[PDB]
């Protein structure tokens, strides 16, 4: 069934499961042509596929060449996502294949269902949560590797850095979503909060700064404050 606030803790059990987010797969800039008509130019995108329990991120980069000479690209984009996710799962050892794939957008159910026909025991599920994975291109290192790519490419990250060394998955996911929620609501403020202190650096093999436990607390509070301020501004409340 659908994933929602009720059955949220299932994300962190020992059933392998992956989130799939397709919001950044087909990315364009919109511009004016010489004759004054509008045209799009695609830029590289990505599939955001994530084990919420372990933080393993499979960032399949979608090179603009994929789109060459194809029509109805937004629709294509959903099948290419399905195609790449299915190929991912087939690439994995059996004991690593997910028991569930949760799509962040319901338009992906049919394409993933069709492409997983060979895995009838992998449940494809929608979710009611409003997850912020579209802000994944607000993470500098993820955006850099997408935009530099010159060909289809898979890049693996752990999106929790070394956090699980010290905190549970539930906590790790809540931090992640809080950070991406913030990046999504006001990227400039969110990023200022993260980097204001030159003395807290990002390890070469990490996405986020090496905050101590106490500094994470301060950071999370600042992100929370950010999100609420922006809400009041959005709705004049």
């Amino acid at each position: 069934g659908a994933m929602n606030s009720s059955n949220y803790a299932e994300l962190f059990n020992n059933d392998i499961k992956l989130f799939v987010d397709d919001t950044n797969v087909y990315r364009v800039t919109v511009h004016k042509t010489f004759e004054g008509n509008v045209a799009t130019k695609a830029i590289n995108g990505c599939i955001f596929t994530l084990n919420p329990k372990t933080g393993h991120l499979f960032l399949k980069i979608i090179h603009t060449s994929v789109w060459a000479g194809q029509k109805r690209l937004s629709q294509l984009a959903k099948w290419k996502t399905a195609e790449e996710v299915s190929a991912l799962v087939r690439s994995l050892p059996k004991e690593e294949q997910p028991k569930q794939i949760i799509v962040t957008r319901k338009a992906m159910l049919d394409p993933l269902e069709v492409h997983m026909l060979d895995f009838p025991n992998i449940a494809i599920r929608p979710t009611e949560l409003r997850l912020p994975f579209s802000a994944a291109m607000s993470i500098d290192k993820l955006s850099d590797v997408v935009m530099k790519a010159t060909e289809p490419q898979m890049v693996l990250f752990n999106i929790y850095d070394d956090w699980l060394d010290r905190i549970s998955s539930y906590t790790a996911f809540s931090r992640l979503t809080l950070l991406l929620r913030a990046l999504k609501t006001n990227e400039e403020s969110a990023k200022m909060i993260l980097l204001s202190d030159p003395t807290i650096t990002i390890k070469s093999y990490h996405l986020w700064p090496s905050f101590t436990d106490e500094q994470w607390i301060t950071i999370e509070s600042q992100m929370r404050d950010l999100i609420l301020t922006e809400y009041g501004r959005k709705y004049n409340v």
Partner: protein, 300 residues
């Protein structure tokens, strides 16, 4: 012209014969239906005064033998049976006609309705969908479930319609996922028409048979089946031109014949709106679309 005699009518029952129907009273001297047109299948069906639930009946074809109806007070229903003694049977039918205790199949000569609805229905195919090979006629009722329904209990009493499933390996060639899901021509033309049904007539026949069982028995799985077969055609980019023209005729009479008060359970909104207005064949059902809009504009 053929005859289906009834031994008696012990219980008050609504009797249908094709699209026609009569009220018969408890132990009314009713002894059958005469002047039934040869050349088509027919269905004789019942709804007891006391149980407006379970509509039931018998598909049959009089070329295949002498059939009659007899009430069973143990099993509580009007049963179709076959008389093997041709002389004994003409004798019953003659005596009852003499006594004038039979209703006449009330066909208007102008009317092609029943032909139109049964054009491709053949008794031999019905008996594969309703498997009971000891009888030449086929029983169906409101509650019988289909094979596809069963997979998602008693196989003897199932409707063995061809299973159509848009999200299945059968429907989708590995490597043509998007193509084949978005454009079911492959599934229709190769898998179903060339593979299983062999020709469009058999395809249309199951379709009309499914429609008829839904209309006459409110058999839900048959409704499901009808919509599935329509949707498969309408969601194929490439359909023989002769099939499209015939489909438009098929559906028109089916829509024409549906009871107005039943359009709410018998017509799947999604399928019809998709078929008429979104599908590849949105422009190929002119008559079906015209009759749907004028008679059921709400559903759309």
């Amino acid at each position: 012209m053929n005859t289906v005699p009834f031994t008696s009518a012990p219980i008050e029952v609504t009797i249908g014969i094709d699209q026609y129907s009569f009220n018969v009273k408890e132990n009314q001297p009713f002894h059958g239906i005469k002047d039934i047109p040869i050349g088509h299948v027919h269905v004789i069906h019942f709804q007891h005064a006391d149980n407006s639930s379970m509509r039931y009946g018998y598909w049959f074809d009089c070329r295949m033998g002498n059939f009659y109806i007899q009430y069973d007070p143990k099993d509580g229903l009007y049963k179709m049976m076959e008389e093997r003694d041709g002389a004994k049977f003409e004798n019953i039918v003659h005596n009852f006609k003499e006594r004038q205790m039979m209703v006449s199949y009330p066909k208007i000569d102008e009317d092609d309705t029943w032909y139109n609805l049964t054009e491709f229905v053949q008794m031999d195919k019905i008996r594969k969908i309703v498997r009971k090979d000891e009888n030449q006629f086929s029983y169906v009722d409101s509650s019988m479930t289909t094979v596809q329904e069963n997979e998602l209990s008693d196989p003897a009493h199932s409707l063995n319609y061809t299973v159509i499933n848009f999200k299945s390996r059968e429907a989708i060639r590995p490597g043509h996922e998007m193509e084949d899901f978005l454009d079911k021509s492959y599934y229709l033309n190769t898998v179903m028409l060339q593979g299983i049904f062999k020709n469009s007539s058999n395809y249309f026949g199951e379709l009309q048979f499914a429609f008829l069982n839904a209309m006459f028995f409110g058999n839900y799985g048959s409704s499901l089946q009808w919509h599935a077969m329509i949707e498969l055609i309408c969601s194929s980019a490439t359909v023989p031109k002769h099939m499209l023209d015939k489909l438009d005729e098929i559906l028109y009479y089916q829509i024409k014949t549906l009871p107005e008060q039943y359009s709410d359970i018998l017509l799947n909104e999604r399928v019809w709106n998709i078929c008429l207005y979104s599908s590849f064949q949105k422009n190929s059902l002119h008559n079906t679309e015209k009759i749907m809009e004028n008679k059921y504009p709400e559903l759309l």
